[PDB]
Ligand binder design. Sequence first.
Ligand SMILES: Nc1nc2c(ncn2[C@@H]2O[C@H](COP(=O)(O)O[C@@H]3[C@H](O)[C@@H](CO)O[C@H]3n3ccc(=O)[nH]c3=O)[C@@H](O)[C@H]2O)c(=O)[nH]1
Lengths: 124, 124
Amino acid sequence: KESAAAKFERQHMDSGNSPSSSSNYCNLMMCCRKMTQGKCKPVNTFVHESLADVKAVCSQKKVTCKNGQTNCYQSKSTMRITDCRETGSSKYPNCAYKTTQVEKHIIVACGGKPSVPVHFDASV
Amino acid sequence: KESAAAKFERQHMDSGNSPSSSSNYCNLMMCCRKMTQGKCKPVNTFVHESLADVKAVCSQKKVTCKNGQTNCYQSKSTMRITDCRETGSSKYPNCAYKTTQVEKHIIVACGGKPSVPVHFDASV
Ligand SMILES: Nc1nc2c(ncn2[C@@H]2O[C@H](COP(=O)(O)O[C@@H]3[C@H](O)[C@@H](CO)O[C@H]3n3ccc(=O)[nH]c3=O)[C@@H](O)[C@H]2O)c(=O)[nH]1
């Protein structure tokens, strides 16, 4: 169970000199989007473009996925993305991430009908 | 179950938002700290001082609680806090918060033995 003292910590404590700094984004986002459940997802990319633009990638340049499959697509334009990668000392339940903001083309794997993104493959 | 498409959206989509966006701090924190589970917590304050300093408040100025309770103490100094308040359009499952940073004295309700902070009462 969670003690009352632990709950107060969870709900109200965030010690830090620049709590809202962009360097804390990955830590907060990976937590919020539940990618730190039982383990720390080692790498994950967030795309800051409209869902419509990302879905449209499924009808763009067809490329080969890192895994051999050929259901991957690369965006014609670059997109604003944030790479979140576990730091050296990241260790469950203390997951830690480095935030890197870049502008690159995205490669996603598409599936279903109509075709929509189902996995983030890489960026170039 | 969560579809492959919905999962892709959860893990990878953050449209119209950016890591450098400080006003989005409350949205990320309320989510990450589980205060948007099944309902939207209306108001919540995060303290950016060290935990040792917040715990020390339990031995400071005894005051009447502002919210309905007892055993409240007011910090002798001001502390850096972020006030998170639901926006007028907030509605579960779409919770939304307005972020406000400010420096004020905090009043916390203490309990346990040793006495430690268990509820956040108000900032003055
Ligand atoms: N993963 C994660 N990171 C968080 C959270 N809240 C804030 N952060 C981030 O964590 C960074 C600093 O971490 P810290 O100084 O180690 O502070 C941690 C964190 O704010 C809190 C909840 O996890 O526990 C703290 N913690 C964690 C482990 C430990 O040994 N000691 C300790 O104080 C900040 O830059 C911020 O971005 C959270 O709930 N989860």
